């Protein structure tokens, strides 16, 4: 239920939230710490009432309606700002990460520093998931070990310098292009070229798109939890819609989604089974907690 | 305008909706029409749709007000098929807490109700086609005795139920256990001691009172129903053979019939199965709500089934007994078993039907004239009252309502009452309320005035014209009805009474029992009813007959307004208190609308309403609610509201509001000044002297107050006299005296002894000519009737005088310039003052109201002088009859409701008129030094003792007369008399009256009987003689010599 | 495909219903005692929902609502806030869609200029300057209101607006701006009561009024809040970044944006409906007609754009 | 503007017409919708209706130009089911 204990979020599934006697009770057909940091995430087969919303409103409990398992995040309550200028009088807990994000965002130098930190975290996740953890490999995802290490080292040696955002984007594209071929070799799926715009008919392409959608939903949940808007991107261009969501999701995109997609293509599993496997893997690695921690660290390590 | 008609009708309603709407519009979809239309055409279409509307009818009309904004105009029929905005659902998928007990009691009493018709005497009387012989004992009494026999004396409330529940029981030996009032030793009443268990007693009271209330004689009242005896219910002095004949059953009681016993056993088993049913026995017996709702259902079912034709599909086909014979031929019609089973089936059906009456009956919703705010600062209390009522709506629905509209006369209280009772209603459903005027007879003009003031057509407001009739046919028609064996075949409402309604009567919930065009069905189907309090009194004051059904159903299914409620005579107050108690008993909400309500009357009525509401809350609604009546006060200056559970806090709140209203009333500028006039002390001389004085008096008043335009001075005046015969004598004296000096006088005679259509014509003319306003001389002089009269004569001065009885105080919105008033009571003085300059503003300071020093009844030397109308009695005499002593001189400076609303202290009940009125009212209504509270403190509702000890409209026994045209010759008119459903011929009792005209005096505001009769017959599309017998009645006290009739003076008694 | 969010006409206030998905359609259910009625909600033409007392929503219905960019708010019945946190009240709990990705230029401008107090008071002054102009426009230079019975004293309105503008020009800080706004609103209430011969009107707070004008004003505040929330979400600016009403109200940008049309279109219509004996549904439809005819949503969007652009 | 959508579709076309029109309008009758709308939204609705239109599709949109004067805006699909003013026959026979 506790999707991310680092942020105090909870996932309710198949239960009706209502008020009887002045206390919210989830009457499933639970003991919840109702406080300024509760942050419920209602899921499949859940219905809420107006009284429940009122009692969750005079408790600082932000409420969001997410999909099945946690992603996507359809709609959620809006987080307020803790800036001294405003004086929000409520039981809520306004966040202070938007202030730091705005304070570092406009300077291109600090934006680039944060983007390079993002890429470093991405590569570290690749090396940890692909090599340090053999659970995926033992599941049937034997890899070329040394080749992946060489590619990760080359990507790090390219990202550690060459300023300008386009250079970092090109480096990320090259890393992904090499990584896709390495994964194809590892799973022996054969020749495979990713079809842009989600027009591919191969199992690998559709599974990768489904994983993209799930990761984007998780990143939206993380940004909503922290309170940063989606516009203030760090990697993508300032004109890209929902840039921050894409940047945050890219941390767990190539590390977890690609191997699971290739393994599900090998096994020939259905889309629902592949999605369930992806959700289980994302739960295992504390992906949401990792993205929250990475965003918090990026914000703090630039002040 | 462009309108869009959408139909959700089904089954038979769809065919008629298509048939009607295809003539007014073009189709757009499968069930959608659309057409340009005008407002008049839209109203015509709506009324056509509402006339022929079934239960499945559902038509909505939309309108385009502002771009991108549609507006629902109205919904005809079932409004639940559309939401508030008029949309339709995309898919539809699937509080009475004592209904079952009432249903079981009613069904059992229906099964045992006519078991006494098995008597040999009754069977012989039914078969006796010869000379009728009155039965010694009433069939209800022997039915009750048979119930006592079956139940057995002293038997427990479970033993007899289980015995009757055993279908394998044919032990007719129980007949030996029966008693016989015909036998000697005076057998004890079936209700005393333990002759009946506490439940069989309730069923026995239902049996014994299914035709008339057990009114007897004689602590006794509190012990009811125990003191009921054989002498209480009918019984006649007959020989021993006749008395014995009523007890022998040769063909056997309907116990051998298989179906009857099977149904009885089923009912008994159902009663036994019910948890705790045999425990509320004593509670149910003394419960007015349960007993009276059960009796209404039983009596209505009996009335319906007594008229049905014979049925061979139920009951023993070859049963030896019979219940009634058809009145057309006299042949036997219904077997006793079939009658009892049918009465029980219809009783069960009615008990099931009753809870649906709050949603199945037509209501008035979406009315904008009741929600529209006003634009003039004068009528700005009508909005404060509406807001106050809306603030209370929920609490009033939850707990009840007792409103008091104390606004002064001329402020437009009718629209205020309508708006208040519409605000108290749920906006989604609509409103249903009655307007009970405090008049003896309601003319059609008053009903049309109510319709105009409320802005409602005849599709939303019905008018019950005429007045209530005391039992006259109780001796003649009852003979035939009892001979036919169906004593419950008399109409639920009177015969001459007509309900002027043109609304939804097609598929009403109670069409089966009431009829379709019957006057009870229109009385119940009308969302808003305009009747008199005398029409609703038979709900609580009906002793013999089914007259209590339709008023009671109206009370249960509507709110209540009591217009001019204080106009009732002091002796008739307890009847009104009983009516208010029963209005509070069946869930109605009562709003009193009078400007001169004394505190004692208000306190008594509030106590009655609270007492009734407690018992109502004990049977309908969420249990445990506290009896906190949502009292409200409305006035021309403000509106308050509070909850009160006792007469101790309500009195304080009323006193506070009265004090505030008096404080605001003192600061008002004066518009009426009263001057006392001393008259010089038989009829042909006293009337002549009065007519002599009222020439100089009228001249002085006209000189003081008048209207001037183009050098011509016209003034409208009113002369009110206590009684009618002195009024007619004084009219003759004035007429044969002429104008005083150069002052041309037009006289109008207006009292209650004219034909009803003639009276309505006089009222119609007086309500159109006496509408005035500030600076209206240019329009006043241009009015046609005034124009001709002014132009015909050459005198510059005209005196338009109205000579009126006390009938001109209620329902008349007239603005006079001056008035000469005889003193009857302070309320009359206040009401007649509230009419001189009631529409205009600006006072010249000169006296405009003249009060005679003493009334005619004092000049003649009669004592008490203030009686009929009045308050003086031998028990409460007055030490003087001169107005110079009975009135405070400070009152003449400013006359308003102040002396009547507040209670002076200390009370001098034999030297001040208002003090006498307050003393009498507080002596009767409350207590002070056969009380009214006994109606609800003791179980006196189970007998008619109270209705006889404190009768309503007692005293004079009037008879209905009319000027019926001859059948062969329409020109010839005959003085007839309604005797018993047949107009006899009484030309010998009527004579012409000769009137002498003085110099320069004609009559204005009169009408010709023939022209008005033919005009109203054409308007109503009725036969001329039928119109004369339906709307031309005159109620006159029986006089041996006869009467003298003149068209301009009405019927004057001749000796 | 659904209409552009700024070109949508409907707005739904719901009560005593159950919002759910029935056969792929977003519908709300009302219990008619012996039956349940399902009413469809045109999500492709509705800007936002308002769920009053006795409402409830499900995850499927909320998913289909947050797929056409339809906002959902949990208001309170009878013109009452959701609750009252001691001295402050919150009226609507907004559930803004998060799967839809919003433009990213106005948001950057707003976050860039929002953290400077002087640059944020400049924005409040510019916000009030448009409110005054639209009040003038709607009350005087438009015929639709006059043809419906609104006859405002032109000279009195002109002098009131001139005094308000003069006070605005010399505003030292936010408190004086709020005081001037309150004074202008009270004087406008008096003028509107006189114009529609409504009598004597005294404004009641926290939904305590009984006369139709107070109830209709309290109800129309919700429509204004819904339109303002829609506009702010469409531009991508968070509700919390307020410029004027951030001291006491959570999500104050909604109230600041709604103030532009609250006194210019809601106010005359409230008294016009009161005089006409309208129920709450009729007043709501009349207000929606007024907002759609005058393009209130487009005005809010354009005013937000202009403030953001001039902030740079 | 206020528009009134009336459908005469049959068989497979009725299902799609209901599916499309229930998202843009509120029902008034069995086959009648009505909603306030803007010009851009009206064009969007018309193009959506015309894209997925079979041979049985028949949708008419009315408009109120001037009091007591309705105006047919367009007909999508089989225009023979409505007359010039947009009415419908009460009975059709071979």
Curated annotation (Swiss-Prot), chain B:
**Where in this protein would one find the motif DEAD box, according to its record?**
563-566
**Does this UniProt record's set of keywords contain ATP-binding?**
yes
Its annotated function is as follows: CRISPR (clustered regularly interspaced short palindromic repeat), is an adaptive immune system that provides protection against mobile genetic elements (viruses, transposable elements and conjugative plasmids). CRISPR clusters contain sequences complementary to antecedent mobile elements and target invading nucleic acids. CRISPR clusters are transcribed and processed into CRISPR RNA (crRNA). Cas3 plus Cascade participate in CRISPR interference, the third stage of CRISPR immunity (Potential).
What GO annotations for molecular function exist for this entry? ATP binding; helicase activity; hydrolase activity; metal ion binding
Name the family the entry cites.
In the N-terminal section; belongs to the CRISPR-associated nuclease Cas3-HD family.
One GO biological process this protein is involved in is:
defense response to virus
Q: Which InterPro entries match?
A: Cas3-like_C, Cas3-like_dom, Cas3_I-F_Cas2, CRISPR-assoc_Cas3_HD, CRISPR-assoc_Cas3_HD_sf, CRISPR-assoc_Cas3_yers, P-loop_NTPase
Q: Which SUPFAM superfamilies match?
A: P-loop containing nucleoside triphosphate hydrolases
Instruction: Tell me the protein's name.
Output: CRISPR-associated nuclease/helicase Cas3 subtype I-F/YPEST
Residues that hold Mg(2+) according to the record: 114, 210
Q: What is its EC number?
A: 3.1.-.-, 3.6.4.-
Report the residue ranges that make up the HD Cas3-type domain in this protein. 95-305
From Swiss-Prot, chain C:
The record's listing under Pfam families reads: Cas_Cas1 (PF01867)
Q: Which UniProt keywords apply?
A: Antiviral defense, DNA-binding, Endonuclease, Hydrolase, Magnesium, Manganese, Metal-binding, Nuclease
Q: Which family does it belong to?
A: Belongs to the CRISPR-associated endonuclease Cas1 family.
Q: How is the cofactor bound?
A: Mn(2+) supports cleavage of ss- and dsDNA, while Mg(2+) only supports digestion of dsDNA in vitro.
Q: What is the recorded phenotype of mutating residue 245 to A?
A: Protein is unstable
Q: What is this protein called?
A: CRISPR-associated endonuclease Cas1
Top-level division of the source organism's lineage: Bacteria
- Under Enzyme Commission nomenclature, its number is 3.1.-.-
Job description of the protein? CRISPR (clustered regularly interspaced short palindromic repeat), is an adaptive immune system that provides protection against mobile genetic elements (viruses, transposable elements and conjugative plasmids). CRISPR clusters contain sequences complementary to antecedent mobile elements and target invading nucleic acids. CRISPR clusters are transcribed and processed into CRISPR RNA (crRNA). Involved in the integration of spacer DNA into the CRISPR cassette. Acts as a ss- and dsDNA-specific endonuclease.
Per the UniProt entry, what species is this protein from, by scientific name? Pseudomonas aeruginosa (strain UCBPP-PA14)
Cofactor or coenzyme needed = Mn(2+); Mg(2+)
- Enzyme kind, highest EC tier: hydrolase
Identify the InterPro entries for this entry. Answer: Cas1 (IPR050646), CRISPR-assoc_Cas1 (IPR002729), CRISPR-assoc_Cas1_C (IPR042206), CRISPR-assoc_Cas1_N (IPR042211), CRISPR-assoc_Cas1_YPEST-subtyp (IPR019857)
The consequence of residue 214 to A is: Slight decrease in endonuclease activity
Q: Which GO terms describe its molecular function?
A: DNA binding; DNA endonuclease activity; identical protein binding; metal ion binding
Assembly, per entry: Homodimer. This bacteria does not encode Cas2; Cas1 must interact with a different protein to insert spacers.
Regulation (activators, inhibitors): Inhibited by EDTA.
Q: Which residues bind Mn(2+)?
A: 181, 245, 259
Query: What outcome is documented for mutating residue 181 to A in this protein?
Result: Protein is unstable
Return one Gene Ontology term, BP aspect.
defense response to virus
UniProtKB/Swiss-Prot annotation, chain D:
Q: Which domain of life is it from?
A: Bacteria
Q: What happens when the gene is disrupted?
A: Infection with phage DSM3 inhibits biofilm formation; disrupting this gene restores biofilm formation upon infection with DMS3 infection. Normal biofilm formation in the absence of phage infection. Decreased production of crRNA in the presence or absence of phage. Disruption of the entire Y.pestis-subtype CRISPR region disrupts crRNA production but does not alter phage resistance (possibly OLNs PA14_33350 to PA14_33310, plus the flanking CRISPR loci), indicating this CRISPR is not involved in phage resistance.
Q: Which family does it belong to?
A: In the N-terminal section; belongs to the CRISPR-associated nuclease Cas3-HD family.
Quaternary structure and interacting proteins, as annotated: Interacts with Cas1.
Q: Give a short account of what the protein does.
A: CRISPR (clustered regularly interspaced short palindromic repeat), is an adaptive immune system that provides protection against mobile genetic elements (viruses, transposable elements and conjugative plasmids). CRISPR clusters contain sequences complementary to antecedent mobile elements and target invading nucleic acids. CRISPR clusters are transcribed and processed into CRISPR RNA (crRNA). Cas3 plus Cascade participate in CRISPR interference, the third stage of CRISPR immunity (Potential).
In its UniProt entry, what is this protein called?
Answer: CRISPR-associated nuclease/helicase Cas3 subtype I-F/YPEST
Gene name, Swiss-Prot/TrEMBL:
cas3
User: Which part of the full protein does this chain span, and how long is the full protein?
Assistant: 1 to 94 of 1076
């Amino acid at each position: 239920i506790l999707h991310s204990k680092r942020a105090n979020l909870y996932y309710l599934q198949h239960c009706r939230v209502l008020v009887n006697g002045g206390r919210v009770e989830y009457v499933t057909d639970w003991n919840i710490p109702i406080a300024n940091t509760t942050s419920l995430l209602l899921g499949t087969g859940t219905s809420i009432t107006q009284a429940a919303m009122r009692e969750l409103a005079r408790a600082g409990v932000l409420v969001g309606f997410c999909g099945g398992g946690g992603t996507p995040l359809f709609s959620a309550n809006e987080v307020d700002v803790e800036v001294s200028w405003l004086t929000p009088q409520s039981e809520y807990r306004p966040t202070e990460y938007l202030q730091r994000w705005v304070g570092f965002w406009f300077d291109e130098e600090k934006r680039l520093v944060a983007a390079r930190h993002f890429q470093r975290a991405r590569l570290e996740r690749i090396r940890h998931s692909w090599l340090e953890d053999r659970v995926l490999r033992d599941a049937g995802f034997a890899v070329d070990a040394t080749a992946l290490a060489v590619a990760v080292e080359d990507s790090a040696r390219a990202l550690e310098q060459a300023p300008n955002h386009e250079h970092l984007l090109t480096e990320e594209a090259r890393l992904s292009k090499r990584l896709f071929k390495l994964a194809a070799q590892a799973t022996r799926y054969g020749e495979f070229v990713r079809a842009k715009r989600g027009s591919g008919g191969d199992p690998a392409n559709r599974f990768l798109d489904h994983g993209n959608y799930l990761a984007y939903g998780l990143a939206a949940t993380a940004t909503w939890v922290l309170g940063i808007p989606h516009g203030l991107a760090v990697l993508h261009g300032k004109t890209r819609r929902g840039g921050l969501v894409f940047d945050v999701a890219d941390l767990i995109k190539d590390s977890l989604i690609l191997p699971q997609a290739f393994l599900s293509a090998m096994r020939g599993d259905e889309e629902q089974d592949f999605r369930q496997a992806c959700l289980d893997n994302l739960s295992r690695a504390q992906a949401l907690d990792f993205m929250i921690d990475t965003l918090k660290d990026v914000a703090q390590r630039s002040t | 305008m462009n309108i869009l008609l959408v139909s959700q009708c089904e089954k038979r309603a769809l065919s008629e909706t298509r048939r009607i709407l295809d003539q007014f519009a073009e189709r757009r979809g499968e069930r959608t029409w659309q057409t340009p239309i005008t407002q008049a055409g839209l109203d015509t279409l709506r009324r056509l749709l509402k006339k022929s509307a079934r239960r499945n009818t559902a038509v909505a009309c939309h309108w385009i007000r502002g771009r991108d904004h549609s507006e629902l105009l109205w919904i005809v029929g079932d409004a639940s098929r559309f939401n508030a905005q008029g949309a339709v659902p995309t898919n539809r998928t699937c509080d009475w807490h004592s209904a079952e007990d009432i249903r079981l009691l009613t069904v059992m009493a229906a099964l045992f109700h006519d078991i006494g018709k098995a008597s040999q005497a009754f069977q012989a009387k039914l078969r006796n086609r010869g000379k009728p012989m009155a039965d010694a004992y009433r069939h209800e009494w022997v039915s009750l005795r048979l119930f006592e026999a079956f139940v057995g004396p002293g038997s427990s409330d479970e033993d007899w139920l289980r015995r009757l529940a055993d279908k394998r029981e044919t032990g007719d030996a129980w007949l030996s256990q029966l008693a016989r009032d015909d036998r000697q030793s005076a057998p004890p009443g079936p209700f005393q001691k333990s002759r009946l268990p506490p439940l069989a007693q309730a069923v026995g009271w239902l049996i014994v009172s299914h035709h008339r209330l057990p009114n007897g004689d004689h602590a006794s009242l509190a012990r009811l129903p125990a003191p009921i005896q054989s002498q209480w219910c009918g019984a006649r002095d007959a020989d021993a053979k006749e008395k014995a004949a009523c007890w022998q059953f040769p063909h056997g009681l309907p116990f051998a019939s298989a179906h009857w016993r099977a149904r009885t056993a089923l009912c008994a088993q159902s009663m036994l199965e019910r948890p705790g049913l045999l425990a509320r026995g004593p509670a149910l017996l003394h419960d007015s709500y349960v007993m009276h709702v059960s009796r209404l259902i039983l009596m209505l079912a009996d009335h319906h089934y007594s008229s049905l034709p014979a049925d061979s599909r139920l009951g023993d086909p070859n049963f030896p007994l019979h219940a009634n014979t058809d009145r057309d031929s006299g042949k036997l019609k219904q077997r006793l078993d079939e009658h009892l089973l049918g009465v029980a089936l219809h009783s069960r059906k009615l008990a099931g039907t009753l809870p649906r009456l709050e949603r199945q009956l037509p209501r008035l919703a979406r009315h904008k004239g009741f929600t529209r705010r006003v634009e003039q600062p004068r009528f700005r209390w009508q909005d404060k009252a509406y807001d106050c009522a809306m603030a209370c709506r929920e609490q009033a629905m939850e707990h009840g309502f007792f409103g008091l509209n104390l606004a002064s006369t001329g402020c437009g209280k009718t629209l205020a009452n309508g708006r208040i009772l519409y605000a108290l209603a749920d906006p989604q459903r609509g409103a249903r309320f009655s307007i009970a005027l405090g008049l003896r007879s309601l003319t059609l003009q008053t009903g049309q005035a109510y319709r105009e003031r409320l802005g409602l057509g005849d599709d939303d407001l019905a008018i019950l014209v005429g007045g209530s009739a005391a039992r006259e046919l109780f001796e003649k028609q009852q003979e035939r009805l009892e001979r036919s064996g169906s004593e419950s075949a008399q109409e639920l409402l009177a015969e001459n009474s007509h309900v002027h309604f043109a609304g939804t009567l097609e598929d009403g919930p109670l069409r089966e029992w009431l009829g379709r065009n019957s006057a009870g069905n229109r009385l119940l189907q009308a969302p808003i009813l305009a009747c008199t309090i005398d029409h609703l009194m038979p709900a609580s004051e009906s002793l013999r007959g089914g007259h209590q059904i339709a008023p009671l159903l109206r009370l249960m299914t509507s709110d209540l307004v009591l217009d001019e409620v204080d106009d009732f005579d002091i002796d008739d107050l307890p009847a009104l208190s009983r009516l208010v108690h029963w209005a509070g008993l069946f869930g109605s909400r009562v709003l009193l609308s009078s400007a001169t309500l004394p505190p004692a009357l208000v306190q008594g009525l509030f106590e009655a309403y609270r007492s009734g509401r407690e018992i109502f809350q004990r049977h309908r609604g969420a249990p445990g609610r506290a009896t906190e009546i949502r009292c409200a006060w409305f006035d021309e200056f403000s509106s308050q509201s509070s909850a009160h559970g006792a007469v101790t806090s309500f009195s304080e709140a009323h006193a506070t509001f009265v004090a505030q209203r008096l404080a605001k009333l003192e600061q008002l500028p004066p518009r009426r000044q009263a001057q006392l006039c001393t008259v010089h002390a038989a009829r042909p001389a006293l009337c002549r002297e009065l007519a002599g004085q009222m020439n100089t008096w009228m001249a002085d008043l006209h000189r003081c107050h008048h209207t001037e335009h183009q050098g011509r001075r016209i003034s409208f005046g009113l002369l009110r006299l206590a009684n009618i015969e002195p009024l007619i004598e004084l009219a003759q004296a004035i007429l044969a005296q002429g104008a005083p000096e150069g002052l041309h006088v037009h006289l109008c005679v207006y009292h209650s002894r004219h034909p009803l259509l003639v009276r309505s014509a006089i009222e119609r003319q007086l309500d159109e000519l006496l509408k005035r306003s500030d600076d209206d001389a240019a329009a006043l002089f241009a009015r046609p009737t005034l124009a001709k009269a002014l132009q015909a004569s050459t005198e510059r001065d005209h005196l338009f005088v109205v000579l009126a009885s006390p009938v001109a105080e209620v329902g008349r919105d007239h603005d006079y310039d001056w008035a000469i008033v005889e003193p009857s009571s302070m309320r009359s003085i206040i009401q007649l003052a509230g009419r001189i300059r009631r529409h205009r503003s600006g006072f010249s300071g000169e006296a405009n109201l003249y009060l005679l020093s003493r009334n005619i009844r004092s000049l003649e030397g009669q004592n008490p002088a203030f009686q009929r109308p009045g308050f003086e009695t031998p028990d409460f005499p007055l030490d003087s009859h001169d107005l110079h002593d009975l009135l405070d001189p400070a009152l003449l400076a400013r006359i308003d409701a102040s002396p009547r609303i507040v209670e002076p202290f200390p009370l001098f009940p034999r030297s001040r008129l208002v003090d006498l009125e307050h003393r009498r009212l507080r002596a009767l209504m409350l207590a002070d030094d056969l009380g009214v509270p006994l109606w609800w403190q003791t179980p006196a509702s189970l007998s008619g003792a109270l209705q006889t000890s404190q009768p309503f409209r007692a005293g004079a026994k009037e008879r209905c007369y009319a000027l019926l045209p001859d059948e062969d010759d329409e020109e010839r008119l005959h003085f007839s008399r309604y005797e018993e459903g047949t107009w006899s011929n009484q030309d010998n009792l009527l004579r012409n009256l000769d009137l002498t005209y003085g110099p320069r005096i004609q009559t204005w505001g009169t009408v010709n009987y023939r022209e008005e009769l033919v005009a109203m017959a054409g308007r109503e599309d009725l036969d001329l003689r039928q119109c004369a017998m339906r709307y031309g009645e005159v109620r006159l006290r029986e006089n041996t010599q006869g009467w003298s009739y003149h068209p301009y003076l009405g019927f004057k008694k001749y000796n």
